[PDB]
Symmetry: D2
Subunit: 323 residues, 4 copies
């Protein structure tokens, strides 16, 4: 029987999760909770400025029909304590509202038929997993976090490169595309659309949750830029083992054939950011721009769609934790 999931929240990540989940034969979306009116929700599923058009229909009984999910109940309840996914017999909640990003808050979902919650964001006090990095450490936790799009891109690369060459230290800069991004930090009060905006983002702590040995050896920051969706991570690494451009390229390519198949990819075609809109990978390595200096240092860049790679991992994690 397909895994019965419900999506809570229909911002960008929730909408992408709907699209992704609808294409998986081992998933049934049984319910969506949205603040939008039904026809607005249908509109936003069908039409997207970056991801294009998508087929979705309304059934006669005003459930939705999308891909393999032919009978999706639509709810509109803001209060998590009143919200009741029981009529749809949901087993896993994908928590995409941004309002309950903690263990205590999202635990309010655990009632009736619901067994598990995956939070689509970093979350306070919450066991955190990145698919391909530490997801096999999962041990039946009922509320988990899928981390951030940034960590989903950088943690796979760090793991691959540490296994090959042994990371001594690394500095990460994320060029974070935020046109579609819907703090004690004064720069967050300034116009996203007109500016490059450097931001601290808790890189060391994030990495520590999924790669505990590396957390203390890495740090970095983000530069928010006014383009949509496709972001880049730039890792500057110092290794124990000597490296060349070729050896770094070969280590990354080998990983994509094996342990990170379907999660990390290599671009050998010299493409640009817009070519990776809607890419399902967590990271796409820019093969020709790998460089080394001295014996022990390298720079590695990788693209990612900050919605679609993440959302593909979200649903991968739902299938995994359902077993």
């Amino acid at each position: 029987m397909p895994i019965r999931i419900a999506i809570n929240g229909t911002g960008r990540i929730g909408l992408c999760a709907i699209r992704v989940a609808s294409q998986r034969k081992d998933i049934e979306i049984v319910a969506i909770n949205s603040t939008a009116e039904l026809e607005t929700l249908l509109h936003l599923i069908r039409h997207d400025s970056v991801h294009g058009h998508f087929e979705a229909q309304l059934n006669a009984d005003r459930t939705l029909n999308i891909g393999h999910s032919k009978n999706i109940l639509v709810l509109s309840e803001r209060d998590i304590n009143k919200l009741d996914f029981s009529a749809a017999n949901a087993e896993i909640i994908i928590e995409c509202t941004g309002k309950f990003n903690s263990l205590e808050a999202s635990s309010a979902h655990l009632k009736n038929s619901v067994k598990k919650v995956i939070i689509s964001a970093p979350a306070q006090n919450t066991p955190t997993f990145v698919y391909g990095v530490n997801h096999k450490n999962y041990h039946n936790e009922s509320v988990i976090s899928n981390a951030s799009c940034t960590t989903n891109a950088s943690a796979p690369l760090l793991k691959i490169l540490d296994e090959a060459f042994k990371v001594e230290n690394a500095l990460l800069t994320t060029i974070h595309s935020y046109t579609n991004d819907q703090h004690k930090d004064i720069r967050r009060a300034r116009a996203a659309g007109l500016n490059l905006i450097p931001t601290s983002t808790g890189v060391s702590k994030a990495i520590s949750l999924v790669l505990p040995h590396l957390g203390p050896k890495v740090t970095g920051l983000a530069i928010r830029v006014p383009t949509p969706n496709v972001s880049l991570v730039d890792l500057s690494l110092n290794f124990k083992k000597s490296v060349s451009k070729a050896s770094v390229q070969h280590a990354l390519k080998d990983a994509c054939k094996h342990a990170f198949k379907g999660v990390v990819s290599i671009d050998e075609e010299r493409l640009v950011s817009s070519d990776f809109i809607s890419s399902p990978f967590s990271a796409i390595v820019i093969d020709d721009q790998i460089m080394t200096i001295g014996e022990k240092n390298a720079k590695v860049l990788a693209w990612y769609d900050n919605e679609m790679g993440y959302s593909e991992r979200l649903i991968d994690m739902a299938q995994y934790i359902a077993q």
Copy 2:
């Protein structure tokens, strides 16, 4: 007597050089050569989408009157061999067309009253100087290059940090704003306005010209982004001496008080890119985003206006080489 300069070319750098030079009492712009009609040239001097409005007038005899340069002869001759700055008695040519970026090509200017040429770009076979880095090595060369805006930003920082801590290696990434940017590299055939575009840029060779000891120890790349003017350089460095965030901050601040006064600045106000439009500095360090990891590694970011800092250095170099 003020130094008699002529500006060849009225693209973005030539126009910025006009504006800069007009405000210096020790400079007289005696001539401008432009492919534009006279009233078009006047328009483009007065009105700029990023640098705002500027006072300029046309004299009765149809010379221009701008700041301290009250009698600017306007020429329109494409052929360097026919071009004759003699009627204006020009001594130094600021070569801003992009058509003669070599020692052999720009040497065609050396005739009549002209003694020296400064090329506003990297140039083949041409002695290269960055103000504050190696300009005191100047030894009466008649044709020189002022390098690139990128090297003008990164070379001062490398020099400061090497003097303080000894650079073992460094990796540089420039986030290059190219909305106002008027190769064997296929990515250059793609839409600048819609994409992040990674590009090789010959970092090691560029640094080697002005900091020969460091050239072999540094490399990097650029990511072209569709914002105007204000760029960022991100340096990831490994040092011989142990560093902290504080010690790096103090080394940079001390340099701006002394050896790099008027060339490098520090931002302690947590500003964003648009705040540095039209800045005269080669680099403005982002003080709060300096970070270290391990004992020996640091990341330093700095802003620059890719036209105005460079153009202020261009005119600084003209005053210097005139002695």
Copy 3:
């Protein structure tokens, strides 16, 4: 004695109103109410991505000192019923929060020393005035609306052209720049940053409030575009009197010399949108693009900064209603 005003709300319009009011010797800003911390508010006054840097200081007693307003009390009270501008003896409130855009809601300000409220937006059930159009009809109303930036641009032009040629009908399209814009209309749910977005905006009703005879003769719409601040209105008019391009140009120019001096301007210099960032005019006519067809029809375009023209009118209206 200068007129004692307080600004409620420090979004874009409130910040622009602060800057404007600070430069008027007949105004004293006595208080600002803001949800921001004091140092954040100071930052946002001093630094603006589109309007540039502005001088502001903090006094020893932690009032603000800006231009002619040397002792500005800073409050932070969200609840209009608890908010008390009495300590600063404010007489007029400039209501810029967007939360009280009705006669009933903004009437909660009328207590203690406060005599009048000007709402910086269209407001339900509220007497509405556009400076230069109908402000001389003011008759001591204690709560008024300054309409919208769009109506402030279009209503002056309609008035001028109706007086000259007699408007039979007109169609208005506003190209509304919304990068800095902080409904039953599904298009409002789509990405402002990536799209041209056509929107109904109640043109006929808006015009009817300030030009009652014309309201029934005009309609139109807006197209929201992802550029900042500088908008354009495009009016297509059918007149009773025959017109030429020249006669329309002359009617507009004459009005700017007389009845609309300081409110409407003419651009004879063939400028582009960025040249009018921070312009104080309600509308700047694009003289060379006026056209006619047939005997009776014309098209007239005009620029405006959707923050600064409006905010200059807001303070003009405060001075006027204070008498």
Copy 4:
């Protein structure tokens, strides 16, 4: 036998024409002339920042294989007098370089196997046709123009509305998206990427070529905006017959069912500009934003992709003139 065409020039319109023609079973692309290297041309066919990825292969003999065109000879000859499409037996040239936009210049193609030329731009002294408007007036001319994307959008609407209601006069404003746009007009010297730019465009003359009775009754202008591809035309019309919003809607809808089937479409779904990227229609009417005022005036808006609608018409015209 399929019609043998060759595409001269591989800018945006040439590349779109390749993609379009490759999907038509009654067309064979026999040759492409490009200044690009072969692998660069292949890259630009396969990867597009706005139109996405497209399947194309290189055959063993280094012809291209795209859709129904399995044997495309690739040439690289800049000189029209040396260029020889004979080896590929081309019958119709689609002239997309922008270098030969006149009857005299493009007549240099008429040699060897070539019978006809279609110029993908307005062209001096050249018979001009818009598909659906006047293409049935074609009478075996050997060199023709397909006009501009703007005229392809506006002329169909003018024809429909004139037939229904009789146009007395009209004013047209085109919001022309020019991020992907690769004069005596000083505004053309300013930064396209940062500005709204009003431009005269010879509307009356353009319309006169395809709708001679209407040319004298219409005029207008363009406003160039920094978004990609999807443009809007805004027509303000005065009619002899009385109109309502409903009657205008019905006239446009009826035309799309009949005389303009496949050329004009209606949007009843309240979509935004990005939803029409790569649309094949010359114009897509914005049904809900049609408005009238008085008895005789209306405003009609319509979207178009400024590359793809035009390129679909270009190939439609090639099939038509081949008969």
